[PDB]
Amino acid sequence: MKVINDPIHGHIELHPLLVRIIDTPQFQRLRYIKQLGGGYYVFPGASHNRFEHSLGVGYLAGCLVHALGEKQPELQISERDVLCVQIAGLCHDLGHGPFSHMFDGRFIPLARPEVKWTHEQGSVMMFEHLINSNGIKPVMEQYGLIPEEDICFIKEQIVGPLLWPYKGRPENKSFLYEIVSNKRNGIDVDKWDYFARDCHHLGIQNNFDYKRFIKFARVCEVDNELRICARDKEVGNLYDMFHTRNSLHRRAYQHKVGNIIDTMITDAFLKADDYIEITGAGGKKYRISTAIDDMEAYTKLTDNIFLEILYSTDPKLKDAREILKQIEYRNLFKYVGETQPTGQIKIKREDYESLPKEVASAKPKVLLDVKLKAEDFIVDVINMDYGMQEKNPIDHVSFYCKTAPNRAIRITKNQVSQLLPEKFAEQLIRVYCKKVDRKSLYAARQYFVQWCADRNF
Amino acid sequence: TMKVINDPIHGHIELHPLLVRIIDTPQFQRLRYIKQLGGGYYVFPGASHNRFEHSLGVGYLAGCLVHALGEKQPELQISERDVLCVQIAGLCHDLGHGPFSHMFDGRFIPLARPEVKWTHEQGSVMMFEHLINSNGIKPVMEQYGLIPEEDICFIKEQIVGPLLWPYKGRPENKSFLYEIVSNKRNGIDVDKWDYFARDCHHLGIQNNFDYKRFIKFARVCEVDNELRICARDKEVGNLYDMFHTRNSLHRRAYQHKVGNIIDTMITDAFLKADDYIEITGAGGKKYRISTAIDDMEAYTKLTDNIFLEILYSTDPKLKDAREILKQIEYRNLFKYVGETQPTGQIKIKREDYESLPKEVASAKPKVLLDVKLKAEDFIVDVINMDYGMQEKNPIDHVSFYCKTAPNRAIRITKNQVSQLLPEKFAEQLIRVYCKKVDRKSLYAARQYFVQWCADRNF
Amino acid sequence: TMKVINDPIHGHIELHPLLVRIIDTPQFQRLRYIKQLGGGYYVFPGASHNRFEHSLGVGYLAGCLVHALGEKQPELQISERDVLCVQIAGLCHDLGHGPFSHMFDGRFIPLARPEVKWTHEQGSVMMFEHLINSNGIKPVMEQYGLIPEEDICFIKEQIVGPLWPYKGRPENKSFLYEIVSNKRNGIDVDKWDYFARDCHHLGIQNNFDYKRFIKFARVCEVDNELRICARDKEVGNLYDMFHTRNSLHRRAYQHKVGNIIDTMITDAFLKADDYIEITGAGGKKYRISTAIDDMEAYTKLTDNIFLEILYSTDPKLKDAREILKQIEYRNLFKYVGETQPTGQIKIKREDYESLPKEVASAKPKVLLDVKLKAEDFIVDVINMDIDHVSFYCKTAPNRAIAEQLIRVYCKKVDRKSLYAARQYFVQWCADRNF
Amino acid sequence: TMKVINDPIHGHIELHPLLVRIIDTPQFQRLRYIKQLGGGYYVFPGASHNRFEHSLGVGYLAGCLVHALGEKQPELQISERDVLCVQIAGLCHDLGHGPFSHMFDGRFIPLARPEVKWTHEQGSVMMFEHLINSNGIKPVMEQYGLIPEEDICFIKEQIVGPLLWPYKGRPENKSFLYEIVSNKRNGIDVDKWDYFARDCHHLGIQNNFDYKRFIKFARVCEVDNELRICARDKEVGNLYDMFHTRNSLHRRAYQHKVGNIIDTMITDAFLKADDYIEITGAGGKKYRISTAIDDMEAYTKLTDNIFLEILYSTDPKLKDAREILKQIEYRNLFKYVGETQPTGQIKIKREDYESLPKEVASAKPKVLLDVKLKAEDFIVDVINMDIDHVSFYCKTAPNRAIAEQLIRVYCKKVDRKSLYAARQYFVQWCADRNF
Ligand SMILES: Nc1nc2c(ncn2[C@@H]2O[C@H](COP(=O)(O)OP(=O)(O)OP(=O)(O)O)[C@@H](O)[C@H]2O)c(=O)[nH]1
Ligand SMILES: Nc1nc2c(ncn2[C@@H]2O[C@H](COP(=O)(O)OP(=O)(O)OP(=O)(O)O)[C@@H](O)[C@H]2O)c(=O)[nH]1
Ligand SMILES: Nc1nc2c(ncn2[C@@H]2O[C@H](COP(=O)(O)OP(=O)(O)OP(=O)(O)O)[C@@H](O)[C@H]2O)c(=O)[nH]1
Ligand SMILES: Nc1nc2c(ncn2[C@@H]2O[C@H](COP(=O)(O)OP(=O)(O)OP(=O)(O)O)[C@@H](O)[C@H]2O)c(=O)[nH]1
Ligand SMILES: Nc1ncnc2c1ncn2[C@H]1C[C@H](O)[C@@H](COP(=O)(O)OP(=O)(O)OP(=O)(O)O)O1
Ligand SMILES: Nc1ncnc2c1ncn2[C@H]1C[C@H](O)[C@@H](COP(=O)(O)OP(=O)(O)OP(=O)(O)O)O1
Ligand SMILES: Nc1ncnc2c1ncn2[C@H]1C[C@H](O)[C@@H](COP(=O)(O)OP(=O)(O)OP(=O)(O)O)O1
Ligand SMILES: Nc1ncnc2c1ncn2[C@H]1C[C@H](O)[C@@H](COP(=O)(O)OP(=O)(O)OP(=O)(O)O)O1
Ligand SMILES: [Fe+3]
Ligand SMILES: [Fe+3]
Ligand SMILES: [Fe+3]
Ligand SMILES: [Fe+3]
Ligand SMILES: [Mg+2]
Ligand SMILES: [Mg+2]
Ligand SMILES: [Mg+2]
Ligand SMILES: [Mg+2]
Ligand SMILES: [Mg+2]
Ligand SMILES: [Mg+2]
Ligand SMILES: [Mg+2]
Ligand SMILES: [Mg+2]
Ligand SMILES: [Mg+2]
Ligand SMILES: [Mg+2]
Secondary structure (H helix, E strand, O other): OEEEEOOOOOEEEEOHHHHHHHOOHHHHHHHHOEOOHHHHHOOOOOOOEHHHHHHHHHHHHHHHHHHHHHHOHHHOOOHHHHHHHHHHHHOOOOOOEOOEHHHHHHHHHHHOOOOOOOHHHHHHHHHHHHHHHHOOHHHHHHOOOOHHHHHHHHHHOOOOOOOOOOOOOOHHHHHHHOOOOOOOOOOOHHHHHHHHHHHHHHOOOOOOOHHHHHHOOEEOOEOOEOOEEEEOOOHHHHHHHHHHHHHHHHHHHOOHHHHHHHHHHHHHHHHHOOOOOEEOHHHOEEOOOHHHHOHHHHOOOOOHHHHHHHOOOOHHHHHHHHHHHHHHHOOOOEEEEEEOOOOOOOOOHHHHHHHHHHHHOOOOOOOOOOOOOOOOEEEEEEEEEOOOOOOOHHHHOOEEOOOOOOOEEOOOHHHOOOOOEOOOEEEEEEEEEOOOOHHHHHHHHHHHHHHHHHHOO | OOEEEEOOOOOEEEEOHHHHHHHOOHHHHHHHHOEOOHHHHHOOOOOOOEHHHHHHHHHHHHHHHHHHHHHHOHHHOOOHHHHHHHHHHHHOOOOOOOOOOHHHHHHHHHHHOOOOOOOHHHHHHHHHHHHHHHHOHHHHHHHOOOOHHHHHHHHHHHHOOOOOOOOOOOOHHHHHHHOOOOOOOOOOOHHHHHHHHHHHHHHOOOOOOOHHHHHHOEEEEEEOOEEEEEEEHHHHHHHHHHHHHHHHHHHHHHOOHHHHHHHHHHHHHHHHHOOOOOEEOHHHOEEOOOOHHHOHHHHOOOOOHHHHHHHOOOOHHHHHHHHHHHHHHHOOOOEEEEEOOOEOOOOOOHHHHHHHHHHHHHOOOOOOOOOOOOHHHEEEEEEEEEOOOOOOOHHHHOOEEOOOOOOOEEOOOHHHOOOOOEOOOEEEEEEEEEOOOOHHHHHHHHHHHHHHHHHOOO | OOEEEEOOOOOEEEEOHHHHHHHOOHHHHHHHHOEOOHHHHHOOOOOOOEHHHHHHHHHHHHHHHHHHHHHHOHHHOOOHHHHHHHHHHHHOOOOOOOOOOHHHHHHHHHHHOOOOOOOHHHHHHHHHHHHHHHOOOHHHHHHOOOOHHHHHHHHHHHHOOOOOOOOOOOHHHHHHHHOOOOOOOOOOHHHHHHHHHHHHHHOOOOOOOHHHHHHOEEEEEOOOOEEEEEEOOOOOHHHHHHHHHHHHHHHHHOOHHHHHHHHHHHHHHHHHOOOOOEEOHHHOEEOOOOHHHOHHHHOOOOOHHHHHHHOOOOHHHHHHHHHHHHHHOOOOOEEEEEOOOOOOOOOOOOOOOHHHHHHHHOOOOOOOOOOOOHHHEEEEEEOOOOOOOOEEOOOOOOOOOOOOEEEEEEOOOOHHHHHHHHHHHHHHHHHHOO | OOEEEEEOOOEEEEEOHHHHHHHOOHHHHHHHHOEOOOHHHHOOOOOOOEHHHHHHHHHHHHHHHHHHHHHHOHHHOOOHHHHHHHHHHHHOOOOOOOOOOHHHHHHHHHHHOOOOOOOHHHHHHHHHHHHHHHOOOHHHHHHOOOOHHHHHHHHHHHHOOOOOOOOOOOOHHHOOHHHOOOOOOOOOOHHHHHHHHHHHHHHOOOOOOOHHHHHHHOEEEEEOOEEEEEEEHHHHHHHHHHHHHHHHHHHHHHOOHHHHHHHHHHHHHHHHHOOOOOEEOHHHOEEOOOOHHHOHHHHOOOOOHHHHHHHOOOOHHHHHHHHHHHHHHHOOOOEEEEEEOOOOOOOOOHHHHHHHHHHHHHOOOOOOOOOOOOOOOEEEEOOEEOOOOOOEEEOOEEEEEOOEEOEEEEEOOOOHHHHHHHHHHHHHHHHHOOO
16 A cells, blocks of 8 residues: 655555556546646736645545544445445546636637537547556456446446446445535535635635534435435534635636636637647547547646647747747736626526627717727626625534434524525626727727626616 | 843733732732633633733733834824833733632622622722832832822723713823723723734634734824724724624634633632632721722632632532532533524613523423423523624724825725625524533523524524 | 544544443543633733543544454454454543643642652542442443443553553453553654644644555564564654654653743642542541542542632732733743753652752852842752664564753842853752753 | 736735836746755645745845835945846846755756856856747847846846956945845845745744845945845844744755655656657757756756656656656655764765765675665765854944855665665765765
């Protein structure tokens, strides 16, 4: 057994199978993908990658399954179950692209709007390619795993079911599907891991305490299926969890300067495409947008490409190059304004492309010498929620009492406190102007105020 | 001749000779034997800190804030006298605390002497006067440039309210100096900053607020013909987070059920042990626990020691009280029965609690069980949660400013921040305990409690 | 059932019902009012912790270490009875401190009753016996699978020392006797808790990493008997331990002002004795120095005594009380001199009253007009004691491969008398060859 | 306007607009892509920080110390231009680092061009001159009250050494300003405090030094006729603790068994990859990895990207180097053979680095050697292992004052019998030459 030293956790022990899986090009590719993407250009201490995040998530999944097993010997938890859960926690982010959430957040929807792609599909495909190429099946068989069923069990833990829709484990082990990714209420070890790590690196103090949560967790057989349950004295702690998630999102992840830097990087990638060449299986050639359909080509697509565009000399990639150079001089797109949040005038994705035009067509009352077209405006729509899209995540949790540990109850928002939030979803709209001269900024402000007053925000 | 003292929360804090002179007095050293969280030490074993270090840290933070404000804007004309007066006020702002701190003025004085209104800030002012008079600090203050006649009143008005522009210590143009140690318009000051960090450090909990950023982004504005401190308009969410952290601390630690019941038992022991404890004051007169607040010589000798004085006693007269304390040693506490759902903070006035238990004894449950319980077998506790105004939003009383127009102060409404902010800012709670340990009486008390709750439609 | 307690240093500590039963007794709760550093609270404001949390943490650490050792080597045959016994021994290892902790048995008893030899470990054993017999704990232990007769002896031997002398356990469990306390090399959980808590409270960065130590801890046979071993690579690991120990002892435990305040407190206690009465077993009245002969009276001896002297009004206590007042104005005794750490004369706690008399009797070579008696001199004796361990190599997991300081203080603080007292000290040192 | 940046180590840092103008340049921004440790990132997962934050923190600490010294001793005649100059010097002290930091100038250049002596401080000075002359900073400096020539010389002399008063930036009166950023006499400077704090925070190791106490108690006192930084006589334990922490870091992190091996593998891959990688410089001329240090416009584009340029290549000419990198991706690392002779009785010089594995093969063991070795299978590591002169001052007298070599050898051939033979060759190499 190896021993690795994590600054966040203590010393992590690794099963030999995990060491075998980690020493592959597919997993080692994560050393060159940043956790927070463009936010590194606002918080200089955020230089961590996904390698340590995956290590920590696997460690925490193993710890949680062990703690659950050693308190209730009637659940019949074996070592192969722990190994499968740890492997699933280890290989849950294999499909991330350059700059992490930017790519599948901004680049793929724009370059190829006819495909529905998420990084979990990429993670599953990467896992399959890794297992097939590196020949891990005999090693798995050596350590007491059954590839035929355990591979599907691991796959379903990452994406979901691909009555009882799962095929990896029976209903008796239903509580094993709510550890790495919870589809019901969103309480899992991923949140704990990146809360701790991001708070450590960014320079902000963390508020949640997951060890206390592990101390009070149980399996209380909710609605004909075994599920993980909490004590009824920890509702406020879960509300605090979600509050700190929201605070992190509004302080760091949705910083407007970081968002505009990400937008500029996406523009550079869009302009530089059709000229970058990537080699895949069979000697075929791919692009940045089309590399997601070949994993041998996807394996060679990391944050390196950024610099490949900055240091290039080809006159064909000149335009994109210029944009990146601006990022190195801090000649960024300027910020004009935003609109107050609203929970009932939602804007769908399909309308995003039409937003800039609406701002360009607004006619301010006072005549202005400067005239701005529809290509001088960037409109960004931000969605803030608790993860359930206007629903209350805490209303899908099951609680038990000290007197009757094996009986599940439900707690309503009115039985906790009157100081809890009245809503659980909102949006924001931000406007940026590409032109940097003062007159253009004044004009953009006039158009923005006219457009906002017209639509009554 | 400036001293250096090391604090585990802050770094190494430097002390002026005048502060060193003031600290080396019995009236200030008395704070070494008064616990901060009181009865909460019996639930959180790490909470053994006292008020001495709290006062030191508050004075240090007040000095730092004044120094930063003077650094940013030279036109404010802040002299050394102002800084030293603010530091002294921060030092002597909690001199009037009694045994187990809040518990005393929270529970004991209102019961033993219900005909008087007493707050520990009045005690702090009286103790400060007694300290200055006894220790002869006036010439020492004069030798360092202070004017006792005006500066003493300035410090007094800093500690308490003003008792048309009502203050007298300074002129109006320095009015921003009155809202550093204690703020009355809202609840932003350095006391909260100090004890948030201290309590989180000692209770094994993580703090969420960062006051250094707030110091980085503070200014002085001329709002309503008054000079007052402003934060920049991008810090609204941080202030909401500050108040959320305050509420979280209150609900997790300060209002713990077992801590509250232990405090109630200690108050009962003190109430029963009175009339048999004599305290010597000025002139050789003898005082009591509830009467010592009328004489500072007797109040100086009243600390947590009295607790143990009742535990180790041998007089037959103090038997009853002694028994109660012994029950705390074996952990035979009053048993939790029930709690009521939250409502607004104004539903039961102060002059109603005495009637609450009797009502629970007047309920007749449908089952109509045996083991009748009298009105003396029930304890009813009323808890009030709020953001500091008990009905209002403190953020509505904060002046902001913008980068483009730093000298112009504005106001930000709740609807302009977010839609996930709390709907209300006040809350009330009721808890019921039973003074019995056998299971049958607990089940009976549960039936009475449910009948009462379903009878007043809470 | 299991009870969870939050610790600022460690995480959430789980307590067995037997430990909860032991904790909820007056004898254990007495530890809430005895401070750890003692007189160091008046130099470092943040050091206000007591021995209650220290005992809790030591028990937690001992249990964790035993559990890890038993889990990583199932051939040692460690049962849950041994884990419970070790946890109990760690829990009740410091029941014998008096007021202000190490000062009392270090400074008060020798100066009060020179003919009596007493350590706080004997007090801990006696108080453990009193706690067990006075609260009816034996049936509770029998209810959880323990054998009281042998287990009580096992715990006592874990607290105090005894061709193998121990009788609590057989010869093949010799590694269980060096967890709570180790007199050979000094690797034990008591010191780990000391280091962690003191560094956290005082504000001094710690350097030892005990989790790493527990990670690579094995039991390998040495000298035909089992001992706890350490991997070869962990040589810089168990050097931060000694560096931190030296740093703490130099920076905090031997600070001049703290020692002076301890000296003043002991002087006030000595003057106060013969007037404070404490009720013991049967109603008999004891004294501060004599209370250690009865545990009924010893249970009520805490830091409270301090304030009892300070707030008194009886005219018989005007002297001791006066001394304490000088602490409250920072009118402390005055440092004069220091002398040999060589140890030529390793002064033991049999003649401490004579030392100031010896200093006074010394006649300086140069005549000094100011005369000083033996009532205005104090002698503070600071008795401070790599001891090497048995390592083990990777390829062979089953194979293995004191000073003293004396300071002198002058009660008189006028410069003229201090000048002469400085001259007396050098003559005394020359006479005693220090 | 002042600009605030958040550092997890130091809190919130204010930057003067001149520093903000210096920072927002490509020559400073290339530091975002060079790692603090290099190979150590492959043993400690949490050591992924770069030199950008290190430079920021060093500048912050230097400014703080200068301000404190000037404030507590007003007779030292410390102006504001001096504070700005010290901050700039601290900001641009590591501007000349190459890929993977100390591995480059310490290991790659000697093995590639032994005829050239080069340190990264010369690179830092050259890059500072390039940045200033290329980004038009001189008028901006003149705008804020600085004289370009004297201040430029002062900063350069603060970075490099003297370049009986050998300095020219400041007179003999300001002799204490030259030991804040870099101090080669004893080794007490902010550059090392930042190293200690950041490395302990990231790796997980905990340090014991407390630099705030040192700054509080530090003063400036006359020693040997010159003004010098002096510490109170009670700081002896703290200084010993500082040295102990430095020793612990060096023996536990910077000299780990596997990090050095990975560094040697990376250097071998780079050496094989040379002669085929082209870098464009001034005037369109193409340079090499070894010769890029002769031009700064080409040196600007030399970062840790080269690694990924070789690993993700398709040119057959780079196959050999590529293969080596692939081994690092499978943990098929070179093995450990032997280690010998601390204290450097010879103190090897850089010029001999590319001759050591020739004497190892030269040695002829008397034992039976059926398997033969050659001067390719051996890699030589020359890992270096490196109380002081402190002028203390007593409380009662405020104004009165009162390193070894190491060698290791690895075998590229990882066969059991080949490893056995290599373990013999080394013994005769060390015994013949008196190691
Ligand atoms: N194997 C491996 N170890 C890593 C990795 N990242 C960090 N480490 C740590 O670095 C240490 C070095 O291990 P190895 O590279 O296998 O070196 P080694 O211990 O001499 O190899 P063995 O002799 O086979 O045990 C490990 O113990 C890990 O704790 C990684 O990606 N793979
Ligand atoms: N004066 C004083 N110092 C305290 C107190 N609490 C902690 N300390 C610290 O303890 C240290 C001891 O200082 P002193 O008691 O005055 O002894 P000293 O260093 O010899 O000072 P002098 O006798 O005046 O020269 C101080 O430097 C403080 O930092 C306190 O209540 N009063
Ligand atoms: N029993 C006990 N708990 C303590 C003590 N000190 C701190 N605590 C903590 O305070 C909490 C209060 O527990 P109890 O005093 O037993 O109150 P309770 O939970 O209502 O009692 P039960 O209903 O029997 O569980 C415990 O869970 C401990 O974690 C102590 O000395 N004894
Ligand atoms: N200028 C600059 N800021 C950085 C850098 N790295 C992190 N930051 C921080 O990121 C924040 C945002 O960068 P800015 O360029 O100032 O964006 P901005 O505040 O909208 O620009 P201004 O309106 O001119 O103030 C800054 O306040 C810095 O604290 C950097 O390399 N350069
Ligand atoms: N003193 C230390 N404190 C904390 N982490 C450490 C320390 N020494 C090493 N580490 C890191 C290095 C690795 O990330 C992990 C363990 O490595 P380490 O024990 O040195 O393994 P190794 O590969 O050198 O030895 P081996 O395989 O021979 O046991 O912890
Ligand atoms: N090494 C240390 N690290 C941190 N805090 C310390 C250290 N030594 C002492 N302290 C604490 C003790 C006091 O709380 C505060 C200042 O004490 P210290 O500087 O030792 O004064 P002192 O009384 O010994 O000397 P003096 O008054 O003669 O300068 O710092
Ligand atoms: N939210 C919290 N975070 C951290 N520590 C807490 C929190 N609430 C309580 N603690 C502390 C108090 C005690 O020291 C320890 C356990 O207390 P707690 O969980 O409240 O038990 P309890 O005795 O009140 O409940 P019960 O008997 O119902 O289980 O943890
Ligand atoms: N809430 C926060 N807590 C801690 N650090 C923060 C927070 N918000 C931002 N930071 C970081 C981001 C930068 O590293 C640094 C300053 O950022 P910030 O205050 O947002 O400046 P800015 O450039 O966006 O605003 P402006 O130009 O309007 O003053 O602090
Ligand atoms: Fe994740
Ligand atoms: Fe306060
Ligand atoms: Fe102990
Ligand atoms: Fe540096
Ligand atoms: Mg290994
Ligand atoms: Mg994911
Ligand atoms: Mg998810
Ligand atoms: Mg001192
Ligand atoms: Mg107050
Ligand atoms: Mg207040
Ligand atoms: Mg309980
Ligand atoms: Mg002991
Ligand atoms: Mg800005
Ligand atoms: Mg350097």
